[PDB]
């Protein structure tokens, strides 16, 4: 007495290893013409903590009727909507829906006409709002719809949402205001998905699915791409030269700040006091000794890296000044779907600080040039001869970026720094 | 003179020297030399 698998049956999906109890999800079997492969919704990848790069999901088919009855009553997807770890929602918008919603709500200058709005209304479950834009020009007929009303067809009429931080007000199922931040869209304490789940908890999955489909259609209509202009991060060549000079000066200022911070020790208590010291020029002219002293001590290295991060936050802040609003990297960083600002800084302006975790027998020459690698007294050539040292804490700053091209010594420094992450 | 050779000439000479080195020793010659030395001596 055996029958083949068909639609409506439930299977227990699991991804090895099971790091949390939400990896076990019961899903209904849907037959597809594709063979030798299983199809999964991209949103459901977050509970499984996996991606589509070779991951294999092994399922379990329950044979007993009681096992099937208990499978969809306790281990089903709708039963696990509340995360048991932090109490928030388990399912998010995703890496694509988040960016699409950010682009819909941030632009506010692209109006959708009647045809496109009606085409996109097929996926949304709710009805069509009033156009709100009757005439945008003296000779413009065919009144259009704003972008924020398109996102308003994803909320029930009785759902009210307020987010003071991003100035987001949702009244009677209509989005009234939004400024920036994109924090309510992402997973958090006061995200809109959590409020929707706490409101009804009966149709949140369908709302999320329809929102994903509509946002995918809208982004296909718009189109998102990454080109060389995004990596250039400049309007023209003069802007690029100005940015390069500004980055160089910022790195020099950060190095000066680190050198100043290195003096906060008990050995320089006589110099830091408000008195008359004739050795003021000695602490400034000794520029090549500060790096050697930093690479030998661990507390000094920690102070130096902390000061470098504090002074390099301002350097990273220049991307919003030298970056346009149409930059794809900036859009994805502000939306929070993928990447951050430091990754963009390393992409375009400069990599920044590069330090290793464990101690090594060599130290970086602080310059990373052709003449530095040939210096017999450089820390990279075993020791600087200032008693002979045996161990060092590498500390290097890379002025170049990936777009310009890494120096071979800079590439060696980057490889030494990144070798730790490849260990088992 | 020092600069009488030119820049492009030195680049071409480097390429030709690399080609000659790859043609003489080949990609693998250390193992062959080690095995031949073990047979003769």
């Amino acid at each position: 007495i055996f029958r083949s698998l068909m639609d409506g049956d439930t299977v227990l999906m699991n991804r090895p290893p099971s790091i949390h109890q939400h990896s076990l999800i019961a899903m209904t079997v849907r037959i597809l013409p594709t063979t030798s492969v299983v199809s999964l919704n991209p949103i459901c990848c977050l509970p499984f903590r996996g991606d589509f790069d070779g991951d294999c999901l092994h399922g379990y088919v329950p044979q007993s009727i009681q096992a099937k009855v208990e499978l969809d009553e306790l281990v089903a997807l709708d039963k696990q909507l509340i995360n048991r770890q932090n109490g928030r929602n388990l399912l998010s918008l995703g890496q694509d829906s988040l960016t699409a919603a950010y682009l819909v709500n941030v632009e506010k200058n692209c109006y959708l006409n009647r045809a496109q709005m009606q085409q996109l209304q097929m996926y949304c479950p709710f009805q069509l709002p009033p156009p709100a834009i009757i005439k945008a020009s003296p000779s413009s007929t065919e009144p259009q719809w704003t972008g924020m009303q398109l996102f308003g067809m994803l909320f029930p009429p009785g759902f009210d949402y307020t987010y003071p931080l991003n100035n987001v007000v949702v009244s009677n199922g209509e989005l009234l205001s939004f400024s920036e931040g994109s924090a309510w869209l992402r997973d958090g304490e006061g995200n809109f998905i959590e409020r929707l789940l706490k409101h009804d908890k009966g149709k949140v999955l369908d709302i999320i699915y329809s929102a994903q489909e509509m946002l995918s259609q809208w982004l296909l209509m718009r189109g998102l791409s990454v080109s060389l202009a995004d990596l250039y991060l400049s309007s023209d060549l003069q802007s690029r030269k100005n940015l390069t000079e500004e980055i160089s000066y910022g790195l020099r200022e950060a190095e000066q700040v680190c050198n100043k911070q290195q003096l906060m020790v008990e050995s320089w208590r006589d110099f830091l006091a408000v008195n008359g010291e004739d050795k003021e020029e000695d602490s400034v002219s000794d520029l090549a000794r500060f790096c050697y002293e930093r690479q030998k001590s661990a507390t000094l290295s920690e102070l130096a890296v902390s000061a470098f991060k504090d002074a390099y936050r301002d350097v990273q802040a220049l991307a919003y000044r030298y970056g346009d609003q149409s930059n794809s990297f900036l859009i994805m960083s502000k939306a929070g779907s993928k990447g951050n600002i430091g990754k963009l800084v390393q992409h375009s302006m400069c990599i920044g600080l590069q330090n290793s975790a464990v101690s090594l027998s060599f130290g970086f020459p602080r310059e990373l040039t052709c003449a530095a690698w040939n210096d017999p007294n450089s820390p990279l050539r075993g020791a600087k001869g200032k008693t002979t040292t045996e161990s060092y804490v590498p500390y290097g700053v890379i002025e170049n970026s990936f777009l310009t091209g890494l120096n071979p010594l800079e590439s060696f420094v980057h490889s030494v720094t990144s070798r730790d992450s490849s260990f088992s | 003179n020092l600069s009488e050779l030119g820049e492009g000439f030195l680049q071409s000479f480097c390429k030709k020297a690399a080609t000659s080195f790859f043609d003489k020793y080949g990609l693998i010659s250390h193992q062959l030399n080690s095995y031949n030395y073990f047979i003769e001596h």
Binding site: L32, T34, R114, A115, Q118, Q119, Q121, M122, Y123, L128 | -
Partner: protein
Amino acid sequence: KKVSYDRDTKIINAASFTVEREDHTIGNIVRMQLHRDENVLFAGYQLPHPLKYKIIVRIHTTSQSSPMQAYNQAINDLDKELDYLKNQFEAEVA
């Protein structure tokens, strides 16, 4: 049945047409032809499942013509336009 008729109970003068074994090349032109009619209020098509070759067309009209009547009128107008284009191309090729 290639074309299925299903009326909408929530909205009056609304219907859904399900066409099997069809692609965007027909739905797009049907939707664009339906927008020319003044009586048509909502006209659109969707392809929910790429694996399942089906096209769903939703037509909403005013209280002057049935959605099926507007659909047939749009089909006839598109056929006439195609015939006129064929005649123009045949005249130009000679």
